[PDB]
DNA sequence: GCGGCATTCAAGGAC
DNA sequence: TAAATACAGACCTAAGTCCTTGAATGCCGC
DNA sequence: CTGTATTTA
């Protein structure tokens, strides 16, 4: 071997903001903006892998032109979230003369928004506000928590949402037909089914498993990815009987090299957001769950932890 | 399902929505409500009109229902009023329809302004360069005098006449504070939420008074030699801007000084080594006005501040105010937006006018209309996910009708946990203090309150076992979503219900530091009396000190003035001292408590031994 | 387009290294007669101005006056890079985005071309009116600046008092004090470090150390310094050039009582 | 002898 | 004088490391 | 929540 090809999230990024399958109101509220310029604060959040970088990116490309050059400043707000980056590099670009369309404005990004530190989000404030005719920031972030409420004061607010499988299905299609792959709807299907809304997720799994196998089918997604984590503890749960309770325990988690630490996590996970059952349930359900976990965070982790779980689980749905 | 009535049927209507309503959702039923021009108050008062009746409607309604007579309609009788009632409105409604006129020729009025405005800009750029369209409608529409902003009307006169007063109290050395209140302090800080116009109105009474402008951002310059580089030069000298910009002229007397506005105070850091603490000595000793504006008031790092100078709050703005501000920002961008709205806009924004802005710039590109069709799409995907104060989450989890079966789906625990670990250091502490102290309203079949508050305070004790298992070594902070669900989650469901009287802040932590203190001065005595006591810290506060009291103080109280001697005899054969003393009477409780004991000694056997001890 | 030709760098390095410590941001205003520049101090208490005429460049050219929004940080940087035998040439094009400092070596045909991007400084122009003071004098740099240098390390105010031909420099600090008395004098030999005074009001005003330092921070342009006072005007700290000049308006203390 | 920069460390915050 | 609503009560300490960040220490360059 | 400050009735 002497070098590799491109992976399909980067191949296949979108470079313009139609090539995106996302929230069709935001992205439409996009290519306004694009279109007509005028570009507002914004703060763009969401999970992990549904388009919220590459909205950014594309927004930037199409407002600027050939000047994203020198009119673009992206910085990943993880790698640079130091008080004095926005107190000099920030602020010396804010303040940097540029001659630009009557129409376009300096872009500042900042991808990882929600990893900044409490001074610079701070000292942002200002900044923001007396060059707030010629640059423009736009924060990329996962949790809008994370950022102070008076930098959410000054911008728009996009919540972007999972993706619906109708989306991801096309998506993935499209990307079929460009690279013809030999598939089939089963395969497209748990590729869908393990991707949780994750388009990002989504593309890697599929281009892993043609590279690994060559056709997407079902069984061969199922072989080299396997199926979401807290769905087997949620049916472990939820079992009517402590045998099968501990059958699955046995077999599906123990036995695969599954951890006792990730086995109760998911099992707080999973009885957090559980529904099916009633609230004083969960709570003391979430109860049993916590003291064991208390008891495997000692290194007192072993099957026979989790078997008390289940079955002390199973006692409290006894009546 | 529901009938499309006529526009602004319910107008001049006052409704309460009670209960929970089978049908739509109380936050479905109050947007409804305010659709057709009804106004929604969360209380029931004498100015209701129609009070909306659902199930499980709390009793107290009902009474007050029942003392003001005022109607009660159930979900039929809102579907006939819906219905029948006439457009418009058909005494209150032609009140309300000249409160509705009065904002649209306001609107209108300062339409034409703004107008003229830009006519008047091309004309000055003809006889002679930033676009128009490339402004934001924040700073495009930014108020240009103290008329144009909306709300706070009280804050801002009070911050003025400080402001014009200041020379007059100066000239006084700040000693005659006035009918006001103000000119006894030198500084003035702004506290409010993000957005309502502080440093707006800061700027607008700064330049309107003829007082040269000096702004440095705090959070953007923290650092205490910056503070004395930039301030303390800056403290008692004129300006070069204001002597070379204008002095020929009789303007004012006071343009050679300077105000300083101090933005983002919050933003600064902490400790003696933070320039915090270097401002607040600032705002002692000063020739020149000090204006600060803040958004968190009462923080920790910005105690100093509490005392020193005068306090203005921004409040939140009310909605009429803003009504016609949104309308004249519409009417001019050219896009359609009925007042209905504007409410349910300032409802979901928590009184961020420039939230508010950004999102009419924002919406309108697409959107060239916003009604009441799309107004839930709008306040979903723009709603301020801010942490609550502690009080708001205590307040929240001891609701029981979050508990309930149609509150457990809406409010679900995963809302539950996030609630707790918005302030996870004080909802634990919270909900302890005031679980026992709400009357409940989800105890089981055959469980009384005292079981419900047992069981509570159980699982309090496990929340503290898990507390303390983090906030120890191994650092078990993964055990963090457990400790929400034991300190507060379960016992909040336990005794989950209305609450009885108010919500008290922790009291643990003012108990913790006064047992702190008493344990360190009891650590100063065992430590002085340890060459005679031979007696550990414990064994000695239990023990000793009855029969301490009894050798020191009962003398005084069964002799008089003469058995100084011995009590000096007995203290200086243990080492004890005048301090000393006074903290041993201090740590005796119930039957025995000393408070009262030494004021009835006579003050001459008190200084006889102080004079003693001397 | 504009292309300006100095005779050494270093002029132009030690120009902006005498007031690249007070102001950060400074707009420079290229006319035929020359070029001009005017900065507000942060705290807008020290004004710096600086003319520098059209014989102090080896060439100079101008079609238009044309503003430059440079930041001193960076142009420090940029001509930290020259040395001191190199002919340097400030270029801009139309519209102007950046400018071009070309160093071009005498000896050699190495040369280095550095750009640098402009800033947009929304700052207004104000005129310096010029008017008669109540004291003038001139008096070495270097002992000015160690005057500065001496008083600044006990308090952070300074009180000048030009009374009865005597000046007096006093600084009332927490730890003691410290005053300064001089006596001017016309030494024959050379003119250089005599102190030429004419005083015809008794001045009493009060500065800022910090200022004081840096205005002394740019003590080697010239080897004396025109101290003008007034006491309802801020005052004037003058080095003069072979064909302009570098002043600092000094805004005074409150005179209270 | 300062001038400047780099390094280190202590104070506060977060989990 | 009442409606009508905002909205304020209050800020903890030991502990473990990591992180930031101001400021002092330290050295080299001139 | 109670209690108080502010705005409008
Ligand atoms: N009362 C008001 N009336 C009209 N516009 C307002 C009002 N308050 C705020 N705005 C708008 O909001 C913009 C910014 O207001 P600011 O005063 O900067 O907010 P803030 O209250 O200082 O909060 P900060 O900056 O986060 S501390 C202004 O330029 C106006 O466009
Ligand atoms: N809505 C979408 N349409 C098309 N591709 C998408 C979409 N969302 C994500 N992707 C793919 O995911 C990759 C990176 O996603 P990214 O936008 O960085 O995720 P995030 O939103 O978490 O930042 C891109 O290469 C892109 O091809
Ligand atoms: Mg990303
Ligand atoms: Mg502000």
């Known amino acids: ?319 | 399902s529901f009938p499309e009535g006529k526009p602004n049927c319910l107008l001049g209507l006052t409704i309460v929505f009670t209960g929970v309503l089978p049908t739509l959702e109380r936050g479905a039923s109050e947007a409804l409500a305010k659709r057709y021009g009804a106004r929604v108050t969360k209380s029931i008062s004498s100015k209701t009109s129609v009070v909306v009746l659902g199930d499980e409607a709390g009793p107290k309604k009902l009474e007050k229902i029942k003392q003001l007579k005022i109607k009660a309609i159930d979900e039929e009788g809102f579907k006939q009023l819906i219905a029948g009632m006439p457009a418009e409105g058909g005494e209150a409604a032609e009140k309300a329809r000249r409160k509705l006129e009065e904002q649209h020729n306001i609107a209108t009025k300062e339409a034409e302004l703004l107008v003229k405005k830009e006519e008047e800009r091309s004309k000055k750029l003809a006889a002679t360069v930033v676009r128009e369209e490339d402004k934001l409608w924040t700073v495009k529409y930014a108020p240009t005098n103290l008329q144009q902003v909306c709300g706070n009307k009280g804050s801002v006169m009070k911050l003025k006449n400080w402001l014009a007063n200041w020379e007059n109290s100066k000239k006084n050395s700040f000693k005659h504070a006035g009918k006001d209140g103000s000119g006894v302090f030198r500084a003035a800080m702004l506290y409010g939420p993000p957005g309502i116009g502080k440093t707006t109105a800061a700027h607008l009474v700064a330049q309107e008074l003829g007082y040269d402008i000096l702004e440095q951002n705090a959070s953007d310059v923290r650092s205490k030699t910056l503070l004395n580089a930039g301030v303390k030069n800056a403290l008692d000298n004129m300006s070069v801007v204001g002597y070379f910009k204008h002095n020929e002229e009789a303007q004012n007397l006071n343009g050679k000084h300077f105000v300083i506005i101090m933005d983002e105070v919050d933003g600064m850091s902490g400790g003696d080594r933070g320039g915090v603490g270097q401002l607040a000595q600032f705002c002692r000793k000063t020739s020149t006005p000090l204006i600060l504006i803040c958004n968190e008031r009462n923080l920790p790092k910005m105690r100093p501040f509490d005392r020193v100078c005068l306090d203005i709050q921004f409040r939140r703005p009310d909605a009429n105010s803003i009504k016609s501000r949104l309308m004249t920002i519409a009417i001019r961008e050219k896009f359609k937006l009925d007042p209905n709205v504007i409410d349910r806009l300032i409802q979901t924004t928590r009184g961020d006018i420039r939230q508010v802005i950004n999102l009419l710039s924002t919406i309108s590109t697409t959107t060239k209309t916003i009604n009441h069709e799309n107004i839930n799409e709008i306040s979903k995907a723009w709603e301020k996910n801010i942490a609550l104060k502690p009080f708001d989450i205590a307040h929240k989890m001891l609701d029981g009708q979050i508990y309930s079966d149609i509150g457990s789906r809406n409010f679900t625990l995963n809302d539950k946990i996030a609630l707790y670990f918005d302030d996870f250091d004080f909802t634990p502490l919270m909900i302890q203090e005031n679980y026992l102290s709400t009357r409940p309203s989800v105890l089981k079949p055959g469980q009384s309150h005292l079981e419900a508050v047992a069981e509570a305070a159980n699982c309090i004790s496990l929340g503290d076992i898990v507390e303390k298992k983090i906030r120890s070594s191994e650092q078990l902070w993964s055990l963090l979503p457990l400790h929400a669900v034991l300190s507060s989650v379960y016992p909040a469901s336990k005794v989950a219900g209305h609450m009885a009287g108010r919500i008290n802040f922790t009291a643990w932590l003012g108990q913790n530091s006064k047992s702190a203190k008493y344990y360190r001065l009891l650590q100063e005595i065992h430590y002085h009396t340890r060459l005679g006591t031979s007696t550990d810290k414990i064994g000695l506060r239990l023990d000793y000190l009855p029969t301490f009291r009894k050798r020191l103080l009962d003398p005084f109280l069964k002799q008089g003035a003469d058995a100084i001697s011995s009590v000096i005899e007995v203290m200086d054969d243990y080492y004890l001292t005048k301090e000393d003393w006074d903290s041993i009477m201090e740590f005796f409780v119930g039957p025995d408590v000393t408070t009262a004991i030494i004021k009835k000694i006579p003050a001459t056997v008190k200084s006889g031994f102080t004079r003693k001890y001397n | 387009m504009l292309e300006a030709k100095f005779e050494e760098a270093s002029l132009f390095k030690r120009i902006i290294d005498g007031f690249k410590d007070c102001v950060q941001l400074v707009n420079f205003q290229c006319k035929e007669d020359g070029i001009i520049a005017q900065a507000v101090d942060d705290s807008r208490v020290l004004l710096v101005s600086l003319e520098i005429g059209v014989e102090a460049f080896q060439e100079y050219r101008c079609d238009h006056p044309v503003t430059l929004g440079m930041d001193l940080t960076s142009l420090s940087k940029i001509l930290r890079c020259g040395n001191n035998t190199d002919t340097l040439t400030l270029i801009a094009d139309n519209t102007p985005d950046s400018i071009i400092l070309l160093f071009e070596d005498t000896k050699k045909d190495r040369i280095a071309e550095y750009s640098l991007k402009l800033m947009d400084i929304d700052a207004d122009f104000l005129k310096i009116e010029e008017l008669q003071y109540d004291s003038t004098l001139s008096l070495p740099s270097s002992e000015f600046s160690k005057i500065v240098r001496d008083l600044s390390q006990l308090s952070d105010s300074i009180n000048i008092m030009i009374t009865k031909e005597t000046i007096k420099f006093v600084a009332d600090g927490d730890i003691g004090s410290g005053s300064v008395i001089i006596k001017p004098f016309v030494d024959m030999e050379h003119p250089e470090t005599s102190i030429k005074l004419e005083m015809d009001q008794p001045v009493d005003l009060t500065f800022g150390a910090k200022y004081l330092l840096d205005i002394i921070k740019g003590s080697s342009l010239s080897d004396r310094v025109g101290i003008r006072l007034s006491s309802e005007a801020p005052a004037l700290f003058q080095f003069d050039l072979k064909s302009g000049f570098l002043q600092f308006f000094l805004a005074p203390k409150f005179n209270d009582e």
Request: aromatic share 4%; with cysteine; glycine share 6%.
């Open chain 1, 1 to 319: 071997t002497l070098s590799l090809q491109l992976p399909w999230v980067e191949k296949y990024r979108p470079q313009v903001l139609s090539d995106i399958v996302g929230n069709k109101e935001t992205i439409d509220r996009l290519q306004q903006i694009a279109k007509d310029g005028n570009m507002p604060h914004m703060i763009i959040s969401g999970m992990p892998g549904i388009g919220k970088t590459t909205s950014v990116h594309c927004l930037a490309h199409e407002l600027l032109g050939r000047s994203y050059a020198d009119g673009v400043l992206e910085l990943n707000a993880s790698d640079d979230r130091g008080i004095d980056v926005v107190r000099n590099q920030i602020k010396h670009f804010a303040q940097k003369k540029l001659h630009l369309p009557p129409g376009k404005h300096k872009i500042v990004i900042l991808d990882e928004a929600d990893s900044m530190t409490a001074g610079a989000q701070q000292a942002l404030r200002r900044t923001m506000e007396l060059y707030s005719n010629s640059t423009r920031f736009a924060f990329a972030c996962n949790q809008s928590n994370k950022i102070i409420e008076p930098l959410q004061s000054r911008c728009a607010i996009l919540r972007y949402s999972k993706l619906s499988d109708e989306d991801v299905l096309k998506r993935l299609l499209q990307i079929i037909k460009l690279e013809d792959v030999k598939y089939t709807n089963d395969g497209l299907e748990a590729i869908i089914f393990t991707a949780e809304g994750d388009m990002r997720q989504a593309i890697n799994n599929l281009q892993s498993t043609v590279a690994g196998h060559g056709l997407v089918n079902a069984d061969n997604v199922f072989k080299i990815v396997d199926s979401p984590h807290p769905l087997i503890v949620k049916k472990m749960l939820l079992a009517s009987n402590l045998e099968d309770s501990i059958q699955i325990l046995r077999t599906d988690l123990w036995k695969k090299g599954y951890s006792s630490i990730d086995i109760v996590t998911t099992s707080f996970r999973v009885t957090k957001n559980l529904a099916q059952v009633k609230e004083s349930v969960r709570l003391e359900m979430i109860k049993e769950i916590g003291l064991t976990h208390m008891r495997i965070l000692e290194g007192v982790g072993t099957y026979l932890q989790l078997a008390s779980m289940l079955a002390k689980i199973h006692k409290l749905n006894n009546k």
